[PDB]
Symmetry: D2
């Protein structure tokens, strides 16, 4: 069931309809690399949902009400007031991924000074760390562990909350590491395991009980806080009749602070937040806000424009609209269901993305000729869809030895910008895969014509084998 839009479209961005011959020429000119295509030559852009979504009329109108004062801005205050009412959190820092680069060293040093945390021993835990969160932890000299559940990565076992903490694993790892050495726990909602999977409130409570017992800070990683609430409302029976706003207020009792990119569920193309619940984390607020100024070794300035704080102050509420959330999730489920139905297999698919197995769909192409890059190119040729390879092409070469890194699965990622495309586009995408699947034997592998040393996936150019 694709639901009907709980909205009227009011503003559209025209996208031209190209011919097959035009797209054939285009994909050659961009070196068989959709990252190098002009946006205007892409009909359905599934590259990312981060900051590419539509917004409501009230959100767009808020951009015209900015107070651009360096300090004391009413736009900053409106944004802090939205955080206070929605999450119950007293302290807000607007960010231009909610300054993981700030809270991480702040929480490491806090435990260092207070409990004799030992940097050579330290380990941070998550139900599943986002890549960048894991990145800033490691840069700071912190090992991470994902304590996810047995069922997380198991497709063909259906489970309501596959993003849950492994509560026993978490307790065991804190004990094994030593709780003085565990500078924070990140609870990621919805979790980035397995395509995007929700986290139950019962689970967060149990997790937060464990963290409070050991006095370990819990940071909610909250880019998808509203979809997580919607899943709790839909699947966790205790919360069936609660509103999204009620589930969210209750949810946030089970963390000490939050970090979020606002570019997903909060429906804006710019911004993030780093927020602290109450005075017990005042000194962590102070220290973060201070490091925000001097993160570089000395003062730097700037910050979100006033109209963008105003827009986010509305977007935190509009992103919780129940009809909207029901519609958004149903559309993502509709695409995955329609792909399954035509025999396209995903290695994982969830709220965040569907990962199509291009290896299996295109079995005649060796992994080193990038069957998921071939399939991205072919989807572009056939339907003007742009999607990102997550396989050997992205994985790239060993920087010590210059050989191609080995890669377990050659996947093509489909993400869906919010409130941007319709059921007819979803049917268009399914139809395109049906065409590809049927023409699969004829699709060629790729080989480099131009290859950068690092980050090759963004600007390499390839030709057909």
């Amino acid at each position: 069931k694709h639901l009907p839009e709980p909205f009227r479209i009011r503003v559209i961005e025209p996208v031209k309809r190209t011919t097959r011959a035009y797209r054939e020429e285009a994909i050659i000119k961009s070196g068989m690399n959709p990252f190098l295509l002009d946006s205007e030559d892409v009909f359905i852009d599934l590259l990312t949902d981060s900051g590419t979504g539509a917004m409501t009329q009230s959100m767009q109108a808020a951009m015209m009400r900015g107070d651009e004062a360096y300090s004391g801005s009413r736009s900053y205050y409106a944004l802090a007031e939205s955080v206070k009412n929605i999450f119950g959190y007293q302290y807000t820092i607007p960010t231009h991924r909610g300054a993981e680069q700030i809270y991480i060293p702040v929480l490491i040093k806090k435990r260092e000074q207070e409990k004799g945390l030992d940097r050579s021993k330290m380990v941070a835990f998550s139900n599943y760390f986002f890549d960048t969160t894991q990145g800033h932890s490691q840069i700071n000299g912190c090992t991470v562990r994902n304590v996810y559940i047995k069922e997380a990565f198991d497709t063909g076992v259906r489970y309501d909350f596959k993003g849950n903490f492994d509560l026993e694993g978490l307790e065991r790892g804190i004990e094994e590491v030593g709780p003085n050495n565990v500078p924070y726990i990140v609870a990621t909602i919805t979790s980035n395991s397995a395509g995007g999977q929700p986290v139950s409130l019962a689970n967060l409570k149990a997790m937060y009980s464990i963290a409070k017992k050991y006095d370990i800070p819990v940071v909610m990683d909250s880019a998808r806080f509203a979809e997580n609430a919607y899943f709790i409302k839909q699947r966790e029976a205790e919360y069936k009749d609660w509103t999204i706003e009620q589930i969210t207020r209750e949810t946030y009792k089970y963390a000490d602070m939050l970090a979020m990119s606002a570019k997903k569920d909060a429906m804006v193309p710019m911004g993030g937040l780093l927020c602290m619940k109450d005075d017990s984390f005042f000194d962590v607020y102070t220290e973060c806000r201070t490091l925000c100024v001097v993160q570089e070794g000395f003062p730097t300035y700037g910050g979100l424009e006033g109209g963008a704080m105003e827009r986010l102050a509305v977007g935190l509420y509009d992103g919780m609209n129940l009809d909207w959330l029901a519609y958004r999730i149903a559309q993502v489920q509709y695409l995955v269901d329609g792909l399954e139905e035509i025999g396209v297999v995903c290695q994982q698919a969830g709220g965040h993305a569907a990962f199509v197995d291009a290896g299996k769909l295109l079995p005649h192409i060796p992994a080193d000729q990038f069957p998921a890059q071939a399939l991205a190119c072919e989807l572009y040729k056939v339907a003007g869809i742009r999607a990102v390879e997550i396989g050997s092409f992205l994985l790239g070469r060993d920087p010590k030895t210059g050989k191609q890194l080995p890669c377990p699965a050659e996947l093509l990622r489909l993400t869906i910008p919010r409130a941007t495309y319709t059921q007819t586009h979803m049917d268009f995408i399914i139809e395109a895969f049906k065409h590809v699947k049927e023409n699969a034997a004829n699709i060629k592998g790729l080989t480099f014509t131009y290859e950068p040393k690092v980050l090759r996936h963004f600007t390499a150019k390839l030709k057909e084998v």
Copy 2:
């Protein structure tokens, strides 16, 4: 085939999803009259496409570039420049239906002074006059005749250009009336006959040949100029490879001036135009612009705001986008086709509206209990759709005798705001009719509880029989 949107949605207006019990209470509170419902309680509002459509990003951004000067505004100039480039017409008057109330008396008096037109004899001709155009002609003491073709109103005969002038009828009526007595001809594109039907370029040329022979002014009534061009491109073989802009420039050679509401194909919620092609109609431009100031008997002032002229200067171009026009028309065709397929019959359906025969769908309800008003209410109850009755309820009472006027057909009109709802809404509407059709026997007729003397359809309240 519903086509995929040739656009990304960028701004949405949220619409809440109501329960059946809520809508039941709502429709009672509004006296079984959807005109009295709050917009926010309507899920799919099909009341009208006039000024209810979405617009493009460039159009919305143009509202921020207004020059509000009383005279000499660059926003006025940008709008005149768009008219000049799109239609070839040299003289533009922005209107806040393009001042039918202005051109009509101007053209009557012109022929009066120049050719001895006799007001007691005069008759104006159209392929099909819009109601208001007919209204201002008659107020001015002018009889109108619609010279439409045999095939116009014939459903089950398919014909590519059912809005065409009856060229022989037009020649005969000018001859019968006397060409001194024919103050103008209005060519309406697309025509309002039969639900909205296009007019061929071959037909307009032939018509304009007739008018030039008699030196009779031709006014193009142009609210749907772009859909008319699209139909010519799709169905008139000579123009198959011409662009919409080329067909439109060629089209407008076959009139002397144009009048249009900008609230349909030009994609704005406010405005219209009254324009004159070249210096041969300079004196008619002068006289119109003059009457625009003193229409009331003395000077009055005002006019479109600058940002609205800017927005319309873009909207005239954006409304011609070929992918957009193909998509818009295909969606309207999709709804009508889907209604036919479930056994819902329309007495007429075309580009502008589909007229569902509520008499036939609800045969147990007498015409005086308003079966199309009942059906409007029931569609609201079942699906939250609002649609307007065009039957005995609208027709109303004889003002000399106070009895219900007799009415030939009890119809429910579906219009579709542009770029506002999706295929999923269209399927939702079809499903609602499928439900109604199946529950038809149980739907009750209506009778007044409150009835105004005039215009009763807007504010009367009714109850079930």
Copy 3:
């Protein structure tokens, strides 16, 4: 004292700085007629304050929140709610001068049916009718009388409320005419007598006491309702500590309905209102709203766009801001004071406009060569200022005899768009007049090179004598 702006400028419209030689060429090209200049060639445009003013951030942002529904729009409701809270008036009709053309025939017929008003006898009264209000009264066959006070037109007598009703004259005229024959009284605030002059609350109460005694409808003509409140706050001692919102609510007890152009104090470039206080005028609301649809002899449609109702719903509040009103009025007073100080004499000057006596400043030019048109041209040449002549040129020719009408005073009007230009522009204007005054003897009179039959001031072209 020019006050400092109680605001930060946030959005500007660039205006180029021209050379004297450029302006000399420009004014020739426009036939010595500033009405024919391009807006972009005018540095300071003082043609009119109607719809040319700036607006606040919240007002501009409201344009993005429109509900474009044909009926039941939340934007209409927000606008009615602002009227209800600000004026206490229960019934609102948005207009695209607040439909004088509607209330006038409605109130005439009301008194006709109810009290045997006799159309051949009828007379309407005002403290001072605006030209268009007088126009629609007369078109409807109603004589008007302005009952203004002795002090109104007397400069050099200073009086706090020169827009007051002559209460004894009003009582005498109702008695002389017969109260059955007086279809309404219009109370104009601020009054258009003498350049714009305020009306006291004590005066409106006394007036409304007279009207209630005779049961005559009172319509508040309200384009400048906020400046009128500000003058009451500043000069009527009883109201010194009341807020503008309190004075306005109290003010509107002393009328039965209001009509206003929103294009002055309500700070928008489009719109007006026609509103009725309470159920005692329900039937007049019904009848107006009905005539709004069928004013032409049959139904016509349209109305303000949703974002424009939203914008006006805010603008009614923002136009009452006390700091803003103090600043606006002080700037207008600053210009007049600075002109007086350099020996420029105005025949009248008040809140609305300053009328410079060009006859006296340029005494060598005969009235038939349009000394105020010459002075408009010269101000353009010297400083790029555009201002409108109110003298023999505007007055024009007798339409029975073709001779120049006789005209008592040859004036040049300066109006000041709200929140648009600064003290430095005001000093620039004063300096320009100082230059003109000093060069006066050398300025030439004008004579026609092209003269339309009617409304010649808008498009005639002249040359120097």
Copy 4:
């Protein structure tokens, strides 16, 4: 001469007018620290010009035309196209101070690999480094030298281009350091020496001749590129009749790349640019763009929103408008001249800021009781002006020893947001200083009630002594 605004105000942000008693209470509540005041309680906010300025109608409208695609955005292309046409530079990277943190390590390593630069020896040169630029150089292990001219800091010697490179000093320092060891030269325009001082084109050419001879990269630090062009047009005779756009294109021949905050002359509240002239710096473009992704040690994402690139693409042109630049600079000069005239002395004053000597104005207050903080508070009390102390309070304490750092001058900085306040505000500020100066003896010093360890100026609270 304050010039009249070469613009009409179109959008205003209301600012309430407070009473003296209210401001007295306010400044106490904010701990005698204007950084802690609400923006809404500040009448004239002179805290900073960075991102606080107004923008043009076209710039604001461009925010509605964003293409939010992750790669290949037409908004990115429009922004690169503006850079190409205005600066002649082929490669653009949009930044959210134009990524000093990126070019610096990139240019250091370039010279390391190519010329055997030795990190222990390296020194970068500028006519005057901005604080943050100096910061990122030093963090990267690079010593900086400012090679400014003798006349730079000398007030009472007037000199047309006090921001010029000391060309002989620069040659001597490269020779003394060794040109292999000089990773870049930054040319800052206008220069931040002495309150903001321009740099001649003759000087930049001579500088770039020196840098090309040694093959040292030159980066133009360009936040005020347009004011610098205006000063060249006004004072460098060779360029008197050239346009701002011509001077800017010619100027940029004399660098290899540019870095700029767009938040000053480019008139936006968000954004910056890092750009490279031609293919000779292609590899530096590649390396910067690459480090932009992996600056943290791993990939992070995001970047300016599409509407913000569109807005900056216009703002680069609108910020060059000659009338605007003449007006902006004249206003800043007007304030400084008016302060001089009443006996207020500035230790330095230029294009960027005026630094009032609070030590001299308030001689009875010891430096350790923060006479410039006292004066900031007093200006707030008297006139609602907010200004930032640059004295012992900002300087703060030695972090090794906890004692107050010694500070040479106790200054109060006045900066002026662009196109935000008028001559009447400037006169208001001068009048406030006149009052302060007259009441000087009575103003009290301050002492801490709450003092953070670091960055105390932002959130410390003080009381009167």
